[PDB]
C-alpha cells in the first residue's frame, strides 16, 4: 500500500546507518558480552590502565600523557572531542543520505545539524554503554563509569548524566532498524531556534515518524507503545544538551589549560 | 558562520 513506501524509506535509512557508522548496537552488543571471538576491548578503569591503554584508544593527540604537561582529565576530555567531531561528521553523512534533506534551505541544514548532532551521538552512546562504562574507538576499548566519576570536577560530571539516560533508553531494547528511523525523526525537528522554513521539515518528519510507527509494530510485534515512550525520550535527549552545554559553559571558565576544536566551536556557539 | 559545518555539508 502506502504502507510499502514507509518499508522502502526504513530500509534506505538502515542501509545508509549502516554504510555511515562504523560500529552499530548489535556488533557494540556483542563485544559487551564477549559473545564475539574478537580481541577483547582493553579495560580502561584507573589513571594507570589509561596509560597502558593510550595508544590503542587512538586518545593520544600529540605526545603521549608521560612526556606531556596535560593532566589525565584533560586528556580524556581532549580525546572524547576527536570521537564527538567524528560522530559529528558521520551523522552529517547520514543525514544528507535522508530523502529531502538535502533539498532543504542549506541554512536550514546547517540549523537542524547544529541543535541534532549530540541528541544523535547521546541516542548512539547508549548503544556502547552498560551500567558498567562504555565502549571507546571503535570497541577496542572500554572506560569504566566510575573511572570516568572519579576524575576531579567538573570533568567527573561530563558522562555521568550519559550513562543515567543510556540505562533508561537501553530498557526499550530498540535495534539497528529502529535507531535509523529514530536518528533522522530528531535530525529533522520542526521546532529548532532559527529555522526559516518549518513547513518542508514537518512534511519530512511526518513521513519519518510513519515509518517509525510502521518499523515499531513490525519489528515488536510482542511490544505495544515504545513509539510513545520512544518520542518522551526525545524530550530527554534536549535536556541531556542543555545540561551538557551548562558543563561547556563552567570549563570554558575554570580552565584555560584548554580550547574547543572549531567544528564543536561552530556547533555549541548561540545554543541553549 | 558554520564554516566546517557548510563543507561537511557541501561535499
Keep these: ?272 | 558562520r558554520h564554516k566546517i559545518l557548510h563543507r561537511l555539508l557541501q561535499e
Design chain 1, 1 to 272: 500500500p502506502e504502507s510499502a513506501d514507509l518499508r522502502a524509506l526504513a530500509k534506505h535509512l538502515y542501509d545508509s546507518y549502516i554504510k555511515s557508522f562504523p560500529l552499530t548496537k548489535a556488533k557494540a552488543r556483542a563485544i559487551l558480552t564477549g559473545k564475539t571471538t574478537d580481541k577483547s576491548p582493553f579495560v580502561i578503569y584507573d589513571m594507570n590502565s589509561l596509560m597502558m591503554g593510550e595508544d590503542k584508544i587512538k586518545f593520544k593527540h600529540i605526545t603521549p600523557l608521560q612526556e606531556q604537561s596535560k593532566e589525565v582529565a584533560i586528556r580524556i576530555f581532549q580525546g572524547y572531542q576527536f570521537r564527538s567531531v567524528e560522530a559529528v561528521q558521520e551523522i552529517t553523512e547520514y543525514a544528507k543520505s535522508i530523502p529531502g534533506f538535502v533539498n532543504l534551505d542549506l541554512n536550514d541544514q546547517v540549523t537542524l545539524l547544529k541543535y541534532g548532532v549530540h541528541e544523535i551521538i547521546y541516542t548512539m552512546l547508549a548503544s556502547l554503554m552498560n551500567k558498567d562504562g562504555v565502549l571507546i574507538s571503535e570497541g577496542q576499548g572500554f572506560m569504566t563509569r566510575e573511572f570516568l566519576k572519579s576524575l576531579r570536577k567538573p570533568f567527573g560530571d561530563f558522562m555521568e548524566p550519559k550513562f543515567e539516560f543510556a540505562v533508561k533508553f537501553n530498557a526499550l531494547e530498540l535495534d539497528d532498524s529502529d535507531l535509523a528511523i529514530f536518528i533522522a525523526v530528531i535530525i529533522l525537528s520542526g521546532d529548532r531556534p532559527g529555522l526559516l522554513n518549518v513547513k518542508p521539515i514537518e512534511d519530512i518528519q511526518d513521513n519519518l515518524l510513519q515509518a517509525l510507527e510502521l518499523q515499531l509494530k513490525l519489528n515488536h510485534p510482542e511490544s505495544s507503545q515504545l513509539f510513545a515512550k520512544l518520542l518522551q525520550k526525545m524530550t530527554d535527549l534536549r535536556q541531556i544538551v542543555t545540561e551538557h552545554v551548562q558543563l561547556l559553559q563552567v570549563i570554558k571558565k575554570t580552565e584555560t589549560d584548554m580550547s574547543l576544536h572549531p567544528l564543536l566551536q561552530e556547533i555549541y556557539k548561540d545554543l541553549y
